[PDB]
Swiss-Prot record:
Keywords: Acetylation, Apoptosis, Cytoplasm, Glycoprotein, Host-virus interaction, Isomerase, Isopeptide bond, Nucleus, Phosphoprotein, Rotamase, Secreted, Ubl conjugation
Function: Catalyzes the cis-trans isomerization of proline imidic peptide bonds in oligopeptides. Exerts a strong chemotactic effect on leukocytes partly through activation of one of its membrane receptors BSG/CD147, initiating a signaling cascade that culminates in MAPK/ERK activation. Activates endothelial cells (ECs) in a pro-inflammatory manner by stimulating activation of NF-kappa-B and ERK, JNK and p38 MAP-kinases and by inducing expression of adhesion molecules including SELE and VCAM1. (Microbial infection) May act as a mediator between human SARS coronavirus nucleoprotein and BSG/CD147 in the process of invasion of host cells by the virus.
Family stated for the protein in its record: Belongs to the cyclophilin-type PPIase family. PPIase A subfamily.
InterPro entries linked: Cyclophilin-like_dom_sf, Cyclophilin-type_PPIase, Cyclophilin-type_PPIase_CS, Cyclophilin-type_PPIase_dom
Listed EC numbers: 5.2.1.8
Protein name in UniProt: Peptidyl-prolyl cis-trans isomerase A
Amino acid sequence: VNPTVFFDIAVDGEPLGRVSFELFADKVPKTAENFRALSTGEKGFGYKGSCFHRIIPGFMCQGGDFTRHNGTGGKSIYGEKFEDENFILKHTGPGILSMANAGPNTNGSQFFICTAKTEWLDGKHVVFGKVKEGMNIVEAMERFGSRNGKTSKKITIADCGQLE
């Protein structure tokens, strides 16, 4: 019953692979639905065509800035920012999907995929999903990052949507 969404990832336009996520709509429905809707583009805007602008191996892949492509933009389906819905779920390890933010209650569209346990983020970023399939692809995306986050090739969400 929890939605699944996919990202088809490209590297300098070359298809890499597909990552699918389970969104924990049961626990963070509002946060889940934001990401779901941005992945289908059903509200007229969303992630399709956007890049992962910050990838730090051993830490996380950050994306979702579909308006400025650099970690300074993005917006939610609710407006520019929305509240931290809850902190039920913890950054328990690789695969966790969580909201980037700039302070309390400033969620927009930027999210990160953890490639490690990031327990220090617990209670600060809202966890709303996890990699269901294609963790290998996230791992592949990691090799294009670097220590300061800059990616060595352009990592883009070439397509995205809802499987169920």
